């Protein structure tokens, strides 16, 4: 349900009116295809002006780890400071992208929850024990890489991230400010 203003000219739905104002939107899960979309937008907005801040909106349930680090690297790569805003939820990989914003520019709405958790395998990976030794050293590497990523951005020790992401830690907006994932909780701006 979305009003598209169609037209041989630009279509201009509200997501175009987000993107022209340098707001990249991450509201779907972080799979490959969404990560591919975000990185294409992060580079385009860098090329349009590398000095104006890119804003990233995060209403994502999270998703895959390599798709996470695809977005993460591109957020960290571009010359523009990334302003991350949490909408509703920033769970799983999307909490890492929320912490991946520029310091001072990591925002959350007051009733947005931030869910941090260790990586999990989607389903069961079968195989020989030498295959599974590789897959388990992999998710331990994914776990360690997620912790040291959240260590860089929350200012905490990676062992503290390890103890806290042992289970699902759901933070509120104020609890994610105290943790270090966001920097400011957005106050309501309504004139009423």
């Amino acid at each position: 349900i979305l009003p598209s203003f169609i037209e041989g000219v630009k279509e201009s739905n509200p997501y175009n009116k987000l993107f022209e104002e340098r707001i990249i939107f991450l509201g779907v899960q972080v799979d490959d295809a969404s990560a591919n979309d975000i990185m294409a937008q992060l580079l385009v907005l860098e090329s349009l002006d590398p000095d104006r801040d890119i804003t990233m909106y995060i209403n994502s349930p999270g998703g895959g780890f390599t798709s996470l680090m695809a977005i993460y690297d591109t957020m960290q790569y571009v010359r523009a400071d990334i302003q991350t805003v949490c909408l509703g939820q920033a769970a799983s990989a999307a909490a890492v992208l929320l912490a991946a914003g520029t310091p001072g520019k990591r925002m959350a709405l007051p009733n947005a929850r931030v869910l941090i958790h260790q990586p999990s395998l989607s389903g069961v990976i079968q195989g020989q024990f030498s295959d599974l030794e590789i897959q388990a050293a992999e998710i331990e590497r994914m776990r360690t890489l997620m912790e040291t990523t959240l260590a860089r951005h929350t200012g905490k020790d990676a062992g503290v991230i390890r103890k806290d992401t042992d289970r699902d830690k759901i933070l509120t907006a104020e609890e994610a400010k105290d943790y270090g994932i966001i920097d400011t909780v957005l106050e309501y701006r309504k004139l009423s």
Partner: protein, 349 residues
């Protein structure tokens, strides 16, 4: 010797209310001009020559740019020529040339050239010689860009040959040679679309979370101004560098506009008390009503010119009725400004 900037601003304070930063500038800049003229005829003694340090006045309409220059005209002891950039053209085209604002300075020194070399030209509305693009214009723009190109030899100082403009062609009364290196140029303009340019420079978007969207109750607005904001407005970059000082006129708030009604010399409520005096009627404003006029004048959004727009949709049934009858006092109450169409308090004989 020279009038100090505290003494120049104290003169400006008698007429202009508000505008603290744009009264320090034009008291500093007039005082530096007075020191340029004293250093230009005397004074080791540091053999340095002084450049003029021109002024660009920003700030919205009706907020005391022209009125702060007309006040500055009243005490200057130096030739002053208020001039309009909306009448200026390139050389070659039908309007007034950019050396006819310099004739007005020579005419301000009654004909004198040596005093006009020491004068001040106030070019009003130079936001109207700005282009409609940050790029070079496709059309020639004889009244816009080409005026800025024609002014910049005069702004930086040149041996300008002023046409006398009383004959059939130009060299019929032997061009007045004037040196404009010590002529101070206070240019001004409202720069209405410039506020949108400044937000797009600083990184403030006007959409989304944490990005400033502007309500009408707000009517960084002309401060944190840079020449790149004025390049993108339509002033050519050669024109802006010759205007180093930005005076930064601001929007007048409600507490300033209350005092603009009552306090200055030709104050606005003094004008209507003068008008009803010709009808033999004393006009009184309660101070709750003066705050109510200025409360509606910020919704009006046209500066202190909006105060005159409020007081004549408030006094309109009064100014119609009262010349046909016999009264003494007309007490404007607060109940007729914010609640429109209320007949005010009458005091008859």
């Amino acid at each position: 010797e020279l009038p100090k900037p505290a003494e120049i601003r104290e003169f400006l304070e008698g007429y202009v209310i508000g505008q603290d930063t744009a009264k320090r500038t034009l008291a500093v800049a007039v005082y530096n001009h007075y020191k340029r003229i004293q250093a230009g005829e005397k004074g080791r003694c540091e053999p340095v020559e002084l450049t003029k340090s021109n002024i660009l006045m920003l700030g919205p309409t009706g907020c005391g740019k022209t009125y702060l220059a007309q006040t500055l005209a009243k005490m200057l002891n130096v030739p002053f020529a208020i001039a309009d950039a909306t009448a200026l053209t390139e050389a070659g085209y039908v309007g007034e040339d950019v050396e006819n604002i310099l004739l007005k300075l020579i005419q301000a020194a009654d004909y004198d050239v040596k005093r006009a070399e020491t004068g001040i030209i106030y070019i009003d509305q130079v936001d109207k010689i700005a282009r409609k693009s940050e790029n070079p214009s496709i059309t020639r723009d004889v009244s816009g860009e080409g005026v800025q190109q024609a002014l910049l030899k005069i702004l930086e100082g040149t041996q300008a040959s002023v046409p006398p403009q009383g004959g059939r062609k130009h060299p019929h009364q032997e061009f007045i040679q004037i040196d404009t290196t010590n002529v101070l140029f206070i240019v001004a303009g409202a720069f209405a679309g410039l506020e949108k340019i400044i937000y797009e420079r600083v990184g403030k978007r006007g959409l989304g979370f944490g990005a400033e969207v502007r309500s009408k109750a707000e009517i960084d607005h002309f401060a944190d101004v840079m020449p790149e904001d004025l390049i993108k407005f339509g002033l050519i970059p050669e024109f802006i560098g010759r205007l180093p000082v930005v005076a930064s006129v601001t929007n007048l708030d409600k507490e300033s506009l209350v005092k603009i009604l009552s306090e200055p010399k030709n104050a606005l409520v003094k004008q209507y008390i003068r008008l009803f005096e010709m009808d033999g009627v004393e006009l009184e404003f309660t101070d709750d009503a003066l705050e109510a006029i200025a409360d509606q004048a910020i919704h009006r959004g046209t500066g202190a010119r909006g105060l005159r727009a409020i007081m004549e949709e408030v006094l309109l049934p009064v100014m119609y009725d009262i010349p046909s009858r016999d009264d003494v006092a007309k007490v404007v109450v607060t109940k007729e400004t914010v609640q429109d169409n209320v007949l005010p308090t009458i005091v008859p004989r």
